[PDB]
Design an enzyme around this catalytic site. Structure first.
Site, PDB file in Angstrom:
ATOM      1  N   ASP A   1      44.889  26.173 -25.809  1.00 19.13           N
ATOM      2  CA  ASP A   1      45.744  25.383 -26.687  1.00 19.13           C
ATOM      3  C   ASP A   1      46.781  24.642 -25.854  1.00 19.13           C
ATOM      4  O   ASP A   1      47.550  25.264 -25.112  1.00 19.13           O
ATOM      5  CB  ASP A   1      46.424  26.286 -27.716  1.00 19.13           C
TER       6      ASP A   1
ATOM      7  N   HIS B   1      28.179  24.941  -9.100  1.00 16.14           N
ATOM      8  CA  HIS B   1      27.991  26.386  -9.162  1.00 16.14           C
ATOM      9  C   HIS B   1      28.158  27.027  -7.792  1.00 16.14           C
ATOM     10  O   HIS B   1      28.519  28.206  -7.707  1.00 16.14           O
ATOM     11  CB  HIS B   1      26.619  26.697  -9.761  1.00 16.14           C
TER      12      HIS B   1
END
Lengths: 431, 436
Positions: free
Chosen positions: A371, A154
């Site tokens: 995708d 992070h």
């Protein structure tokens, strides 16, 4: 009898030479409250070229652009600031695993216990030089489907950066030669003062205590709030007070409702101050605004202080007012620089019962297509860092296959088992 | 043989009146990029017992004194992704084309079974230029019989079907000898502007839907399905005998829409585990406060979506889907819901996010049965013998459109016609389901 077995972990390096360089990070990046590991599972259904070979190749090409991801992060004792050494050097760990079940016996992780989710997530490789901030795992299932698990420092990125990195990775894996957004560094644009004479505000310090804490029987559950309930809570909130021109967001009414229910569930000392922490994007607060290629931390935490009595007695509209004002103050450039200064003071100088932070990851899947042959993950499950989960409630979106939860919101809550029981009962009142 | 349409002239028809020179903003509904499609329709007139082309040119010139934005140019910034319409500048006007056909109106049977590609022979293209495109264009195709087809093209960014109907009726009102349009038109696109929520991520409904084993294909066919009133009536009764609908009545749109959805899931053979999404449009003219006046011709509806798994659509009763369709309509009729829907569209526009997902299971219903119910269109060649809307090529594959039959088919009063675009193999199965 679920068993997930890791077959291999390779270190994947950039496909092109990177000059040896040492990078500094932003004040937001250096915030020791942000040295946690973000984790997310991307669940892909089976198809009617193996996915791990495609993703591994794309990762090496991805590091051609995002080469700081392949470096090593280390905090200097002089500075207590992070340094990122990349180039020549390194590499991102890439793990391939198998599971002895089909994806469907896990319901595409729609109800996954967050401990159980760790079986599909990599950890960060640590070394002399520090830790590599990025790691990937592919768990193959017997259906032919697979889960792409990711871990990310992070200190390196927020959700906006995470989303562009993962989408760039799948874009390359699908045949594209460039990612659609070119990444930049420019972390010096978010660098604060600090002020020598000002004692810093530390969130959670001196907050209302709970009679149930400390305990170690903490439980994490995922709560679902339907679009129907959200409208009826908005409808009722608007009648207590017409916000006139302004609209009240789902994050606002649910956030206020979670705060109330959490204060009551933990039975916080009514005279003690409780503090709602909320993240506000500041991409457009800096001038000029940050480009989309910026993937560092680009938000600041705002804090709403109230007494536990006030939170328990205020109307939802009363709290939304304060939440709205907290977000307005975040949009002032001069406030941003004093937030930055406060963080730097915390760094330079080196419990919270009693502190409540809302996190929003509904947008985890909106920043592009994932995708690359197996058609858009059927579920994206962010997993709250173990380091912060007891303080955090996370907003997330349901699976895109859960047709009865379209427009709903899921909230990952971590509480003592006692408080969690009373917390679910308060949430029942939303329907 | 074959059908040959020859364009004779195209002139830019300018307003017969001085018009303001302005750059107008559009509403949030108008600025929706999904709405940048070109509506088209053919209005068929039979011969009197030459003249009509000239009369409509004058009428169009007078109409543009009122709907003067229609003579402007449409261009969306890349600053804010918002469309702007620039009117009253040099070279403005509406393209107006006159064409002739080598056949009589009788031989196309008043367009009652026209192929959609054939029908494009009668419709104008929109005029494109460095300054964008005009939102409005007209074509009069004269036939050897003496009748003529009034073809029109209309950017959906400019109007919905309500505004389209008022414009066409104002055009024929004027051609018929009236001097005013019966409805005074207003712009005020500021009435429908969303306020994007800073912390609310955009939600694009039905972006990723169930897969079809026939897609992708190049083998798409469009066909016009006809449902007579008595089958509608028989389907309604049967649906009432599944669930006591109170004193709520069930509409033709709901019950046939539900049947279309079931049949389409079966025809396309969609992954039963996947999600299929039904879209319908709900007018919000009276939902806003203050309500929209009748002269408002901008987009004045919101799209509602009903998500289900392809297996639920096949197993649910017709009544089950009707309760869901009615519930969607109730929610579009909430003023606070419409504000958030406006805010979400604004956020979608501003973020300009990548279009993604499988749209095989997305099913969007349009209703254009009301195209000719806004007034007379007699000028006088007598009230059009047929009005044929043409589905936008950009949406045809996920859209079924309701339309009224021709006013010359007695056997089809109360009937509905649906325009269906499917892969050839799916059209076979789909027509069989429609047979009942």
């Amino acid at each position: 009898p679920l068993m997930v077995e890791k077959m291999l972990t390779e270190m994947v390096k950039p496909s092109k030479h990177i000059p040896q360089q040492t990078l500094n990070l932003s004040t937001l990046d250096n915030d020791p409250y942000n040295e946690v590991i973000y984790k997310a599972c991307y669940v892909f259904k089976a198809k009617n070229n193996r996915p791990e070979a495609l993703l591994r190749e794309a990762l090496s090409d991805l590091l051609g652009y995002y080469y700081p991801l392949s470096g090593s992060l280390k905090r200097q004792e002089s500075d207590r600031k992070l340094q990122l050494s990349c180039g020549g050097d390194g590499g991102v760990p890439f793990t391939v695993a198998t599971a002895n079940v089909e994806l469907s016996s896990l319901k595409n992780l729609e109800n996954i216990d967050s401990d159980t989710a760790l079986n599909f997530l990599p950890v960060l490789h640590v070394d002399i030089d520090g830790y590599r901030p990025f790691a990937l795992q592919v768990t193959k299932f017997e259906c032919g489907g697979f889960i792409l698990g990711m871990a990310m420092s992070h200190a390196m990125c927020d959700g906006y950066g995470e989303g562009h990195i993962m989408c760039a990775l799948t874009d390359l894996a699908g045949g594209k030669k460039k990612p659609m957004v070119t990444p930049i560094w420019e972390r010096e644009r978010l660098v604060g003062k600090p002020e020598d004479d000002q004692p810093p505000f530390v969130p959670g310090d001196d907050t209302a205590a709970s009679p149930y804490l400390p305990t170690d029987d903490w439980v994490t559950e995922k709560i679902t709030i339907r679009a129907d309930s959200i409208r009826r809570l908005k409808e009722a909130t608007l009648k207590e007070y017409d916000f006139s021109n302004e609209t009240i967001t789902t994050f606002e009414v649910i956030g206020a409702y979670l705060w109330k229910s959490r204060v009551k569930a933990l039975n916080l000392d009514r005279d003690g101050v409780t503090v709602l922490g909320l993240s506000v994007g500041i991409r457009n607060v800096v001038d000029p605004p940050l480009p989309d290629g910026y993937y560092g931390n680009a938000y600041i935490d705002m804090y709403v202080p109230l007494t536990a009595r006030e939170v328990e007695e205020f109307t939802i509209s009363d709290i939304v007012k304060l939440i709205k004002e907290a977000k307005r103050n975040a949009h002032d450039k001069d406030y941003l620089q004093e937030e930055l200064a406060n963080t730097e003071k915390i760094i330079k100088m080196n419990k919270k019962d009693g502190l409540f932070c809302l996190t929003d990851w509904r947008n985890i899947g909106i920043f592009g297509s994932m995708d690359f042959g197996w058609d858009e993950p059927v579920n994206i499950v962010p997993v709250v860092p173990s380091e912060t989960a007891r303080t955090v409630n996370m907003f997330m979106r349901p699976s895109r296959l859960e047709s009865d939860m379209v427009g709903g919101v899921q909230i990952v809550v971590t509480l003592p088992r006692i408080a969690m029981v009373k917390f679910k009962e308060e949430m029942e009142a939303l329907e």
